[PDB]
Symmetry: C3
């Protein structure tokens, strides 16, 4: 067990760490669209989706991995009518990094911490 800590993803606002590196596998906390430098949450769902994904990227990178090493994500969201937009941002994010798409679950929950539109957790493997 090694704790992952990076200033490139928002600091924990609760009793959790950003990531844990087990050697073979890295787990992230659920990443919300909070900007790591300012603490702000962007209003637009496209911008939230991108920021949540960049926050996941920051943690995986801090472990010595990259987006292509992510093998499973869960995307908790507040509105499935956002699905198409979120998916386009998500596809572009992986495509940008020449990364195979991970396995995924996506469900619409009632509400999320800080009233964000999505929260994304990831599991990555060290090859």
């Amino acid at each position: 067990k090694k704790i992952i800590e990076t200033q490139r993803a928002p600091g924990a606002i609760g009793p959790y760490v950003q990531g844990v590196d087990l050697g073979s596998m890295v787990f992230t906390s659920g990443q919300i669209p909070v900007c790591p430098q300012t603490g702000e949450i962007p209003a637009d769902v496209q911008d939230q989706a991108r920021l949540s994904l960049e926050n996941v990227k920051a943690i995986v990178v801090a472990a010595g991995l990259s987006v292509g090493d992510i093998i499973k994500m869960t995307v908790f969201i507040t509105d499935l009518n956002d699905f198409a937009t979120i998916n386009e941002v998500y596809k572009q994010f992986f495509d940008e990094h020449q990364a195979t798409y991970p396995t995924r679950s996506c469900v619409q929950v009632a509400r999320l911490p800080k009233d964000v539109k999505l929260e994304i957790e990831a599991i990555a493997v060290r090859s």
Copy 2:
């Protein structure tokens, strides 16, 4: 890592793959009750529960594993009033395969892709 692809479960409805095989462990994407031959969703919750499980099965089998290798599932549902009925179908499914019940979490979310009544993700192990 190796992508799992099978015609015996539905194709991806977003930027994800059906399953990933890490050697020691297989992850599936969350499986919804879409019939792979018709692209349609049965109305009855018993039929949906069984079909989501068959979709999970197809992916685990494509990886060279069996129902008995599944060790964790998460069952997202839209109505806990369906819990007892879902549980009966789920219990029978594992019983038919002479398989130990996996660990599980079951929660009622607000909404699921294509307005299905449940979505199930699985983790299986090889050795």
Copy 3:
């Protein structure tokens, strides 16, 4: 692929086992605040949070692991108004065991089994 069974966590309310020990990793089922001795659910959310965490601990300890070996939790809750209270209980729980906080996801769902206010699942690692 050892099943974990302990009297210090409630018996299963559906077709699942309390925990599975894979050797390298232990998974628990989602634990709800049901008292393993009495079957009763405490009314106050501070008490529900402590009890769900004790139920998780019971399974992790039954496998021969410690609170400090927990590396990921997911906390499903029904009311974000309860979040600060849950976080305080959760923080104090890890602090009492001198355990660094695991990675975490937290989401507000619509409803949980037995109408409890939270459900917590855990993953722990050996060595």
